């Protein structure tokens, strides 16, 4: 049954006449009658008297009672929703390399809103977009530039990786003035690492023999293992700058690997989301290259 | 909040996809998407997944529960006009320990209502609350006192568990006049299911049997396979028959609650009375 008609019937009783419901609802007296007749025709029963003060019939008393029940439900739901939104964390898919460099400043902005919470899911660039598409996150950092259906994209800047190692490690694999890339132990970030898979492209020509690999599945532990000579690795220039400045590591190579990054968020008129987006863009501007 | 849009979101979930809602509602696929977009802009959150099967987000669960509440009201109203008994299915989450002790008397009451059905779901504590939140059950017996969004809570009383074993089993694990709790085989209802204040230091490995039914769990203790924590209601006959003894004068007490949708529902009110009355008759204060 049409709940607007139920409301119309209720207004008639609460206000006492058809004209009273008309003025209360800001609808014509004709509209009230149309709704009542429809509801009565839908039910198969006469529901209310056309006299004044208006009295509900036996069947009509049912719908009036029902209408007040639905009115109470609607009000309780609105209040319940308002409170749950506050409690529910905004969900983001992000990669470890963004989280370990330029992103943490976003935390400051969310903290100042007063009660907001974040849920970060750590995913590589490719996997990140699927979480957005399916709706499991409201925003996502991704290498993919084309917008997924329902979402808008903003460019954040470019992430640069450097091939770094400790000076001692490099010298250990210098022979005849040329570096033996294949023999040099390398750091890998996970058992699935796309970067470390293609880390010799344009450094070695033919088929590569077997490598010496250590795996450290945290951005900071990964950097520490390189920092400490366990292997060379591809490290975000943000992370490498202090080690290079302190002379703990050196550049093995003037050839960076560049990855443009984007922010994708569901299109919704949410000021919460708008604020989060601005915070992300602003953080990436400060910690990525133009 | 537009009530038509709530129906559409619910249809997406019930039918499993946006296309399913399209066919179910006789509206274009574009209309389904437009209605969701509008509803999402009103809330400020994504409400349902764009995958199949469609799942409500955390925010979406609020609206889905609300939509199912409205469906229940509509059904009770239709039943009142009809001049015939309602025949409304009531879906409940319950724990095995309640179902096997104090709950069954509810069956008599529900049966007497004419036409109505029960769908009981036996669920662990965590999933039980999730079902309530998203609207997959309208009521639940639970150890959780804090109300899930959209629900009201009623205290039912306290469930007492006793640590029991057969005399022969206890004697078998007496060592120098002291019982070796860690070495004694124990019963468990599942792989996710007890020595706190029974052992001080580090616990070694245990020997565990798993029996995933309340009565077989009890039967295994009764028959010496292991000790276990058993509801005093279940244990009383075994204790009276001398089949088991108390390993411990300290019971473990668990307060119980009834959580129900906040709704002016005559079915829900009636079910609550039946549940509360059963708990009054078979649980401790
Ligand atoms: N060899 C490496 N440096 N691998 C880094 C993998 C980190 C991954 N791209 C992420 O940001 O989540």
Author numbering:
A (entry chain B): 1 to 290
B (entry chain A): 1 to 193, 199 to 290
How does the study describe this entry?
LysG detects the basic amino acids l-lysine, l-histidine, and l-arginine and activates gene expression of the amino acid transporter encoding gene lysE in the presence of elevated intracellular amino acid concentrations. LysG is a member of the LysR-type transcriptional regulator (LTTR) family, a large and highly conserved group of TRs ubiquitous in bacteria. LysG shows the typical features of LTTRs, a two-lobed regulatory domain linked to the DNA-binding domain by a flexible loop. Two LysG monomers are coupled by dimerization of their DNA-binding domains, forming a winged helix-turn-helix motif responsible for DNA binding.
Interestingly, all attempts to crystallize LysG in the presence of l-lysine and l-histidine failed, but diffraction datasets could be collected to solve the structure of LysG in the free form [LysG], and together with bound ligand l-arginine [LysG + Arg] at 2.52 Å and 3.00 Å, respectively. The ligand-binding pocket is formed by the interface of the two lobes of the regulatory domain. Binding of l-arginine in the extended protomer of [LysG + Arg] leads to a small but substantial tilt of helix 6 by 8° compared to the conformation in the ligand-free protomer [LysG], which enables coordination of the ligand l-arginine by amino acid residues D124 and E125 in the [LysG + Arg] structure. Within the ligand-binding cavity of the [LysG + Arg] structure, sidechains of eight residues (N95, D97, D124, E125, H161, F189, D193, and F222) are located within a distance of <3.6 Å to the bound l-arginine molecule, potentially interacting with this effector molecule and the other two basic amino acids. However, since no diffracting LysG crystals in the presence of l-lysine or l-histidine could be obtained, blind docking calculations using the [LysG + Arg] structure and AutoDock Vina21 were performed, which predicted the positions of l-arginine, l-lysine, and l-histidine to be in the same binding pocket, with a maximum center of mass deviation of the top ten docking poses from the crystal l-arginine of 1.2 Å, 1.2 Å, and 1.3 Å, respectively. Two 1 µs simulations of LysG revealed two frequently occupied conformations with a reaction coordinate that can be exactly described by the distance between Cα atoms of residues 219 and 96, which are 6.4 Å apart in the effector-occupied (closed) RD in the LysG-Arg structure. Simulation of l-arginine in the ligand-binding site of both TRs yielded no transitions from closed to open conformation on the sub microsecond timescale when started from the crystal structure. Perturbation of the l-arginine orientation by 180-degree rotation resulted in an opening of the conformation, and a subsequent reorientation of l-arginine into the crystal structure orientation for both TRs.
